[PDB]
RNA sequence: UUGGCACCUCGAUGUCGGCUCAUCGCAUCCUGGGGCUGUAGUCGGUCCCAAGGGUUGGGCUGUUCGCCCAUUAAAGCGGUACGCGAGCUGGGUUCAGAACGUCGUGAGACAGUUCGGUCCCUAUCCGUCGUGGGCGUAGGAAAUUUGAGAGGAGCUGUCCUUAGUACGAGAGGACCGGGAUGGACAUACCUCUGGUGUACCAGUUGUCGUGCCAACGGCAUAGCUGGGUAGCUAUGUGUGGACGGGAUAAGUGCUGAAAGCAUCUAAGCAUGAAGCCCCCCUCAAGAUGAGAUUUCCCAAUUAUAAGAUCCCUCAAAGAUGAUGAGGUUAAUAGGUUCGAGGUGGAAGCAUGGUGACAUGUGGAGCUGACGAAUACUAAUCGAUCGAAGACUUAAU
């Protein structure tokens, strides 16, 4: 199949042929390169390891991730590249194709295709039990002291434990979610943009992962 | 909207430079084309401009009218292809920029 | 809501492994007064 | 920006206006870290009115600067408003912004609070 | 929006003038209704002399709202009051003459008998 | 279930419904398979397999339960101190007051009905949801990963065309298989519709401060009213439910013995259910059974190398730790100069009006959180940890 990586930029709309509105996100995807093709004889699985954004070169008093390091730099130039920031493996794609050290163009995505998107969520901190799991809150008048709280937790002296898959507060946020079966609207080539019908996860300037759908 | 200018460039050939100008409280007519078959007609909406927000393709307004006792309102995008033309025929004076005291 | 038992001498001291303090930095004695 | 400093709106708008003034007179003060990262901005927006010097800026150079302090420097009397447009504005006619400077002293004795200096440059 | 214990009005020549909504005809615990929706009502105020007296349960149909409808072309239409029209077993109206406009969505809603009679469709 | 017995508890096992949460069992209420008949067709009826999921809003009296209007694919019976009061309520329940009736010679009762009437606790241990420091994984470190195993999603309806053909005495009615549009539910997001927006913009009353001109500020719920940027949000905006396969219940069968014939199970053997494992999403090598690649670093006890941390500037992250962006060869936050989006035409002079006012110079001026460019301010200074490939037993 086919797969490209890129950053989420924003969200707008376009007018179709029948004047209909279609809402879209705007994915930027430049500078992808193949760095290691795999094998079953070595690893046990065929795949394609890909890296997306460029960064700078080795430096002596190095105290960021802007400037790369030697193990990285010894992996870019191998396949004749520059140091790459992000790295991912794609596993469901044909490997007789995709020779090494090349680039990957958006042009391999037509307009009107079908995809599935994969990214990170947004961050909510320490949150309660009815924003999170979304369940009923209690009376606020008629002499009541139960407003926002999880009521009960167990039964009685039978089953005196508390089962594990139980709903309490804590942290929800930067988890991995996917979205199935969206549509490809339009594909620029100069600005290196791909548009998708619908809204997809993550914050602005984040990272997005795009791949062909497997379903029918 | 110069963020890195990648969104206000793609959405460039969906604009249109055909449309006159208008502030709130400026009567104007709106020649829609409505499709209910192999081919169908126009059916104007007339009224008075109360609202206008935004910038870009997502720039909207709305107009008010009374019709046989009842009030009605319709809000439109500016750059859609349905709207053949706009015809500003009168102009006024106000001190507000959102009008809701008209109900 | 009330302790049912006594806290031993160990469980009191197994707990204070992390209840210490820390050291300042060290610039040439000179302070790290950025 | 957006710091509240455990002080509700009606209080913070008057604490940041006293800091901007008494500074100007003595050009050097001693505060906690947080406050001086907020008069880092209020006072830098307040010389930029002093280079114009027009009749309108004096009218918006008074809605935050503080009531007429009858100074007394060497054999004289000033106002904090006929010192800001006459004297600081003239030293600083050819630089861009950035005319403050924060400096870290140590902590305090009682409440264990980082103490810093702030001056003009 | 139109839910239980809601008071619409009437725009036909059939005697019933005001009503009260007590249901919506979906069924999986549905809790609202917009334009184009068959409901159940009663009467709370009639006109002397007519065909639908006070205290009679009847089914009825929306024709107007304060919340509009989201046309697929990216367009919206919201009126300034609410309204209803009273119907029969044969999927058609009790009275004859319609008053006040209606909404074009009623063409693809099998209510063509009412656009067949009304002054201003819009 | 109403009970019988009186084995724990009276130096306290302290409570009937309803609200919030959930969890198991089938002797199945709906959906799912089929057999059976008077089921011609529909509609059922009967028994058989099946627990994956699903299982309504309101009126009267305390109402546990009871009756009634109105909808629904359907509006299930039982368990878990008649599930849950160190999580909520207190109508009901037996307190002291006072009426009304049966009773008593009187103290008072049997309540046969009504009205009024103080809810104590800073969570130690286990259990549970979430997040981190320390050793270990036969040299040390930076990136990418396999997946033994564990959890999660799982629902359904109507129109119409299929197709009036199999079948149906004809009307009626499938199989087939095509979509179209939906209700409830579960998840990401803010372009639209809209809600808030306490350091943003105009308007507006009262009173203190400049012996007043009002152009300004302070307090009076932000003094009130009209609007509203970034940001988090749903009543808004878009996807999802799977099909598909491997076999198994009842039940349909074929060769085929039983006993010639027979016969669905006996040697055989195809068939077939929303159920079961596989397919779809998420976490996972503390998986002490501690994995697999890729590249980088290499000694005179002992310094130090690859490489990380202290420390300072900040958010796309956040209770604190941690994660992430950047540290003068530098665009990190602030500021300054330009833009956007929002408000709705300043001050100050100049014409017109006796006057309070309106026009023009000018889509004016101001603008917190978003975007860009620019070294003017500060990220200085400098310190601290940190590896030198064991042994057999084989092949080399
Ligand atoms: K109720
Ligand atoms: Mg109380
Ligand atoms: Mg320090
Ligand atoms: Mg008994
Ligand atoms: Mg018993
Ligand atoms: Mg005995
Ligand atoms: Mg005062």
Coordinates of C-alpha atoms in Angstrom, one line a residue, chain A residues 46-172:
Chain A
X46 CA 9.3 -7.1 6.4
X47 CA 8.9 -3.3 6.8
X48 CA 10.0 0.2 5.8
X49 CA 11.6 2.5 8.3
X50 CA 10.9 6.2 7.5
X51 CA 12.0 9.5 8.8
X52 CA 10.5 12.9 8.2
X53 CA 11.9 16.2 9.3
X54 CA 15.4 17.5 8.9
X55 CA 17.6 18.8 11.7
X56 CA 21.2 20.0 12.2
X57 CA 24.6 18.3 12.4
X58 CA 26.8 17.2 15.3
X59 CA 28.2 19.8 17.6
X60 CA 30.7 19.7 20.4
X61 CA 28.9 21.4 23.4
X62 CA 25.6 19.9 22.5
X63 CA 22.7 20.5 24.9
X64 CA 19.4 20.1 22.9
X65 CA 17.9 17.7 20.4
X66 CA 18.2 20.3 17.6
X67 CA 21.8 19.2 17.0
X68 CA 22.1 15.5 16.3
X69 CA 24.5 13.0 17.9
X70 CA 26.9 10.4 16.5
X71 CA 24.7 7.3 16.6
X72 CA 22.0 9.1 14.7
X73 CA 24.5 10.7 12.4
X74 CA 25.9 7.3 11.7
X75 CA 22.5 6.2 10.5
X76 CA 21.5 9.0 8.2
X77 CA 24.6 9.2 6.1
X78 CA 24.6 5.4 5.7
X79 CA 21.6 5.8 3.4
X80 CA 22.9 9.2 2.2
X81 CA 20.6 11.5 4.2
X82 CA 20.7 14.2 6.8
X83 CA 19.9 13.7 10.4
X84 CA 16.2 13.0 10.8
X85 CA 14.1 14.0 13.8
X86 CA 11.1 11.6 13.8
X87 CA 11.3 7.9 12.9
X88 CA 8.6 5.3 12.4
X89 CA 8.2 1.8 10.9
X90 CA 5.5 0.8 8.4
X91 CA 4.7 -2.9 8.2
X92 CA 1.8 -3.3 5.8
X93 CA 3.3 -2.3 2.5
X94 CA 5.1 -4.0 -0.4
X95 CA 8.9 -4.2 0.0
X96 CA 10.0 -5.4 -3.4
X97 CA 9.4 -1.7 -4.3
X98 CA 10.7 1.2 -2.1
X99 CA 14.4 1.3 -2.8
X100 CA 16.6 3.0 -0.3
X101 CA 17.7 6.6 0.2
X102 CA 14.9 7.9 -1.9
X103 CA 12.1 10.3 -1.2
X104 CA 8.4 9.7 -0.9
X105 CA 6.0 12.1 -2.7
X106 CA 2.5 12.9 -1.8
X107 CA 1.7 12.3 -5.5
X108 CA 1.2 8.6 -4.6
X109 CA -2.1 9.7 -3.0
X110 CA -4.9 10.4 -5.5
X111 CA -7.9 12.7 -4.7
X112 CA -10.9 10.7 -3.6
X113 CA -9.0 7.8 -1.9
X114 CA -9.8 6.3 1.5
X115 CA -7.5 6.4 4.5
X116 CA -7.1 6.0 8.3
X117 CA -5.3 8.4 10.6
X118 CA -3.3 7.8 13.7
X119 CA -2.0 10.3 16.2
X120 CA -1.8 11.6 19.8
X121 CA -4.6 13.1 21.8
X122 CA -4.7 16.4 23.7
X123 CA -3.8 16.8 27.3
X124 CA -6.3 17.0 30.1
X125 CA -4.7 17.0 33.6
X126 CA -6.0 15.4 36.8
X127 CA -9.7 15.2 35.9
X128 CA -12.7 13.8 37.7
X129 CA -15.2 11.0 37.1
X130 CA -17.9 12.7 35.1
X131 CA -15.9 14.7 32.6
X132 CA -13.8 11.6 32.1
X133 CA -16.2 8.7 32.1
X134 CA -19.3 10.8 31.8
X135 CA -21.9 9.7 34.3
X136 CA -24.7 11.3 36.2
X137 CA -24.3 14.0 38.7
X138 CA -26.4 14.3 41.7
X139 CA -29.0 16.8 43.1
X140 CA -28.2 20.3 44.0
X141 CA -31.1 21.2 46.2
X142 CA -33.7 19.5 48.4
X143 CA -31.0 19.0 51.1
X144 CA -28.3 17.1 49.3
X145 CA -24.5 16.7 49.8
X146 CA -23.9 14.6 46.7
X147 CA -23.1 16.7 43.6
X148 CA -20.1 15.6 41.7
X149 CA -18.7 12.3 43.1
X150 CA -18.7 8.6 42.4
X151 CA -21.2 7.1 44.6
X152 CA -20.5 3.5 45.5
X153 CA -17.5 1.3 45.0
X154 CA -18.6 -2.2 46.2
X155 CA -21.3 -4.2 47.7
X156 CA -21.0 -5.5 51.3
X157 CA -19.1 -8.1 53.4
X158 CA -19.6 -10.4 50.4
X159 CA -16.9 -9.5 47.9
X160 CA -15.1 -7.4 50.4
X161 CA -12.5 -6.6 47.7
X162 CA -12.8 -3.9 45.1
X163 CA -12.7 -5.1 41.5
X164 CA -9.9 -3.8 39.2
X165 CA -11.7 -2.4 36.2
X166 CA -13.3 0.3 38.3
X167 CA -14.0 4.0 37.5
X168 CA -12.2 6.5 39.6
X169 CA -10.5 9.9 38.9
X170 CA -7.1 10.4 37.5
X171 CA -5.5 11.4 34.2
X172 CA -6.8 11.3 30.7

